[PDB]
């Protein structure tokens, strides 16, 4: 709108750190994927998947 | 002592006696505690591999 905000903002620079472990590395989805040979249950994280 | 000796004694045990104790003349039979035909599970239970 262009309306002033009723309240006053605390605006002021600072440095934030870009942390590691991003998202596109942490998403996970299964659905009839590979399975162990001995137990015949689903594999663990990673692989594919 | 030995196993062959024990088993023999057990097998002789009287039927009305096998029940007198916490045994089962149908499921559990002392004369069974000793192995003789050791069974062999199928690979399905075991693993393998191939480099």
* Positions of chain breaks in chain B, given as the residue before each break (C to N > 2.5 Å): none
Contact in structure between A34 and A40 (CB atoms under 8 Å): no
B6 three-state secondary structure: helix
Q: Which residues of B touch A (CB under 8 A)?
A: 46-48
Residues with Cβ within 8 Å of residue B34, at least 6 apart in sequence:
B3, B6, B7, B10
Task: Kindly calculate the radius of gyration of chain B based on its CA atoms and give it in whole angstroms.
Answer: 17
Residue of B nearest to A37 (CA): B47
Residue of A nearest to B49 (CA): A37
How many Å apart are CA A41 and CA B17, to the nearest integer? 46
CA distances, A13 to each of A10, A18, A41, A42 (Å): 10, 15, 52, 48
CA dihedral A22→A24→A26→A27, nearest 10 degrees, is 150
CA of A40 vs chain B CAs: smallest distance (Å)? 10
| Method of structure determination | X-ray
Resolution (A): 3.7
């Amino acid at each position: 709108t262009g309306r002033k905000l009723v309240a006053q903002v605390f605006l002021g620079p600072t440095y934030y750190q870009r942390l590691k472990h991003l998202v596109d590395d942490k998403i996970h989805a299964r659905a009839r994927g590979p399975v162990q040979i001995l137990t015949r249950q689903p594999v663990e994280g990673r692989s594919r998947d | 002592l030995s196993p062959l000796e024990v088993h023999t004694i057990f097998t002789h045990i009287s039927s009305e006696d096998l029940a007198h104790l916490g045994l089962n003349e149908q499921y559990a039979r002392p004369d069974w505690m000793i192995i003789t035909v050791l069974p062999v599970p199928p690979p399905s239970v075991r693993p393998s591999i191939s480099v």
